[model samples]
Structures are given as C-alpha cells and as structure tokens.
Target: MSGSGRGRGAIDREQSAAIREWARRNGHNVSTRGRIPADVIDAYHAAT
Candidate 1:
C-alpha cells in the first residue's frame, strides 16, 4: 500500500475518494464522499 494519513482527519471530497479506492483495494467498502464512517477510518488505520 502507499501509506496512511492519505485519508485521515477532516477529509475532503477528493481524499474521500482516494480512501475509498484504497479501501476497495483492500476489500472494504467506504464512502466516496461526505462524512466517513468511524469503522472505515479505523479499518484503514488497522490495515497497515
């Protein structure tokens, strides 16, 4: 994977999509926009 922090904290629309793509690659479903779910954020953190 690229790294973390690409989708952490107050994420923007583009960041959201970036994270969503990252999650999808890891076999997870994440919101592409708007507020990201806590679980999704946690999952991303734990993915490393």
Candidate 2:
C-alpha cells in the first residue's frame, strides 16, 4: 500500500497475479499496467 504503487516495468509477481485474478473475475483480460494504464487513467478510483 505504498512506494508510488507498482514499479516501472517491474511489478511484484504476487501483486500482479492478484490483479490478474481480479481482472478475470471482472470479465477483463488485463494484467495491470506496471506504470498505470494510459487509457483508463482514473480506473483506480472507479475500481476502489
């Protein structure tokens, strides 16, 4: 819950996997942007 979030092009596999699972459960097929998504910039807000 810190460190500016996921690192640049380097995300912890554990955290990445979790997000992947979340994506699947939500009917999406994304694995999160290591530096945040460019399309849905405010996705974190809507997601939270």
CA lDDT of each candidate? 0.64, 0.49
On residues 13-45, what C-alpha lDDT tens digit does candidate 1 reach at each position?
465665676677887756555666777767766
For residues 1-48, write the lDDT of model 2, one tens digit per residue: 456575543334555455554556666646444543533334523573
Worst 10 residues of 2 by lDDT: 36-45
Candidate with maximal lDDT: 1
TM-score of each: 0.42, 0.38
TM-score of 1: 0.42
Model 2: how far residue 42 lies from native, Å: 6.3
